[PDB]
Amino acid sequence: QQWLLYLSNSGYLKVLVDSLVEDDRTLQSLLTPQPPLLKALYTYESKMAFLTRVAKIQQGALELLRSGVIVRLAQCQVYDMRPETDMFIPTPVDRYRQILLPALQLCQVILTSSMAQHLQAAGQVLQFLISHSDTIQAILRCQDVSAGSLQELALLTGIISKAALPGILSEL
Amino acid sequence: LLVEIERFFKLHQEDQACATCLILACSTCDREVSAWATRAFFRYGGEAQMRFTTLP
Amino acid sequence: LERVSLDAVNLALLMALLYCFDISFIEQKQYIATIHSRLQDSQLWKLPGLQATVRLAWALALRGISQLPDVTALAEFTEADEAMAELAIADNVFLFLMESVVVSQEEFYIRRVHNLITDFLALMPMKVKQLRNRADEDARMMGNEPPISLRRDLEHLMLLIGELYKKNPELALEYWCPTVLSKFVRQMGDLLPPTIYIPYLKMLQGLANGPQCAHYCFSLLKVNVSWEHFFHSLMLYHEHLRKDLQKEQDGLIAFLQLTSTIITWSENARLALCETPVVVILGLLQCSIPLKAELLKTLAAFGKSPEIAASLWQSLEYTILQTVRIPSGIEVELNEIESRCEEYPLTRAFCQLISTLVESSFPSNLGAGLRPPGFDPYLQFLRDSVFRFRTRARA
């Protein structure tokens, strides 16, 4: 409860969304800092989790979205690219895809958690899919632990798809 | 007659039209269109038609 | 033909090649099978774009040929067709179609090509969806025009239609006449991505050509996206623009191009569209926009022959008069027009609208309340224009 209200306001949201943008930058800086990694894995992952949890509920999702989640995600440019394009390469793919799965879960959760239909949320999510299309398509086939991460990402897109106006349905 | 108020004007007279126009403008629960139109008639009369004026 | 990329001469051979692939049955199909195999191999050549097209075309046809199952069962679709076609698309097979189409023995060419164009709809839909979905996801929320265009294959296809069909209504009718193209149009109508959406609008404009086709396009929106949605979009953009004080220009320019095309080729219907875009279009004109001229051109199309010009004249006078302060002399009046109609496009549009309204009528005591009334100041404005004309740029 409680928190949603308090926390909302403040603080957090603003800061956390801005920090999404910077998350993308932070995954690169990731290589360097593998070391300073220890610090941050304990924190960055925790941040994604905090974001995902807020999204799971109606009021929380609203606050995240109000904070301009889609915008920060566009700014991070995490999605608007191809991961394969480019350490042992399978490790980097696992890592990048890993970031994609959590952010994608955050987006799907925010979408559904409002009224995904006529609501504004549906429109925003559809824009998300179309703008970052072909990644969704590209994700659909291949393998490894990397596959496992890929598989989860694929599911996440599928949930985003049906949850919205069927991304397919929209693309009549 | 709000859209043509000449007919009112003809029968009733200009003065009376103005008076009614004032009442409609002020009148409460009226649509904005009605009030504005009546205000317009009161203030400007009918454009290039009936003019609203002191005459020597 | 390879030993030609630019050479226009390539067009001469397209009739033979399009029709040849059309009649693949004639070949055997030991031969057809061999060609198919050779082509997949031939994916080596990006430099020859036109090889890429023709091959892609062959594929569009081949799929149909495989209908006699002896051939089809033998082949695996993913390996046999989709992989190759996809490669061709990647290698700009659509782009060159667009070029063939844009830069338009006419009978043989038109007939064979329109058969080509249609084959693609019916047989190909899997590819269309594959591409559409690919495009939606690819871009991420500083995009350069080259980046925007890279993935644009679907839009290119729409343009292919637009160029090929344009004029030609004959051909265009095919889309509208029965309720797969008609499916195609419905499908295209669904694609939401702003760029797809704008090309969809453009493609339809091309389709609207006959007085007859124009009528169907009218019905398409009205009955079975609606016209109202379109004006709504324009209205929304208007608010965003003013509240704020390239992507939008693309969308808006397309929106206007379409409304213009139909309104021009229509009848009693004109009033219906007129009442509705008229109010919204007027509002858009107030905003600066690059676009001003274009809405004026559209407005003009809306203007009706009869007495019911009045709403339009008021808009125009109000839309010159509003900002200006007029002294009791003439120059101040000219200034009103000059201030608003700042650029060349603005003026040309204005002239078209005025030409239309002046054709045969206007309200008495125009401009009453605000200024010295009457039509006269507009003609004075032309002094600003055709006085100046002599010193154009740009014949």
Curated annotation (Swiss-Prot), chain B:
Post-translational modifications: Phosphorylated. Phosphorylation and dephosphorylation may be important for the function of NUP155 and may play a role in the reversible disassembly of the nuclear pore complex during mitosis. Disulfide-linked to NUP62. The inner channel of the NPC has a different redox environment from the cytoplasm and allows the formation of interchain disulfide bonds between some nucleoporins, the significant increase of these linkages upon oxidative stress reduces the permeability of the NPC.
Location of this chain's protein in the cell: Nucleus, Nuclear pore complex; Nucleus membrane
Domain of life the protein comes from: Eukaryota
Transmembrane segments: none
Tissue-specific expression: Expressed in all tissues tested, including heart, brain, placenta, lung, liver, skeletal muscle, kidney and pancreas.
Role noted for this protein: Essential component of nuclear pore complex. Could be essessential for embryogenesis. Nucleoporins may be involved both in binding and translocating proteins during nucleocytoplasmic transport.
Disease tied to this entry: Atrial fibrillation, familial, 15: A familial form of atrial fibrillation, a common sustained cardiac rhythm disturbance. Atrial fibrillation is characterized by disorganized atrial electrical activity and ineffective atrial contraction promoting blood stasis in the atria and reduces ventricular filling. It can result in palpitations, syncope, thromboembolic stroke, and congestive heart failure.
Similarity comment: Belongs to the non-repetitive/WGA-negative nucleoporin family.
Subunit structure, as described in the record: Interacts with GLE1. Able to form a heterotrimer with GLE1 and NUP42 in vitro. Forms a complex with NUP35, NUP93, NUP205 and lamin B.
Descriptive protein name: Nuclear pore complex protein Nup155
Full-sequence portion shown in this chain: 523 to 589 of 1391
Curated annotation (Swiss-Prot), chain C:
Subcellular location: Nucleus membrane; Nucleus, Nuclear pore complex
Tissue: Expressed in the testis.
Domain of life: Eukaryota
Role this protein plays: Plays a role in the nuclear pore complex (NPC) assembly and/or maintenance. May anchor NUP62 and other nucleoporins, but not NUP153 and TPR, to the NPC. In association with TMEM209, may be involved in nuclear transport of various nuclear proteins in addition to MYC.
Oligomeric form and interacting partners: Part of the nuclear pore complex (NPC). Forms a complex with NUP35, NUP93, NUP155 and lamin B. Does not interact with TPR. Interacts with TMEM209 and MYC.
Involvement in disorder: Nephrotic syndrome 13: A form of nephrotic syndrome, a renal disease clinically characterized by severe proteinuria, resulting in complications such as hypoalbuminemia, hyperlipidemia and edema. Kidney biopsies show non-specific histologic changes such as focal segmental glomerulosclerosis and diffuse mesangial proliferation. Some affected individuals have an inherited steroid-resistant form and progress to end-stage renal failure.
UniProt similarity note: Belongs to the NUP186/NUP192/NUP205 family.
Protein name, UniProt field: Nuclear pore complex protein Nup205
Native source organism of the sequence: Homo sapiens
Phylogenetic classification of the source organism: Eukaryota, Metazoa, Chordata, Craniata, Vertebrata
Location of this fragment in the whole protein: 253 to 755 of 2012
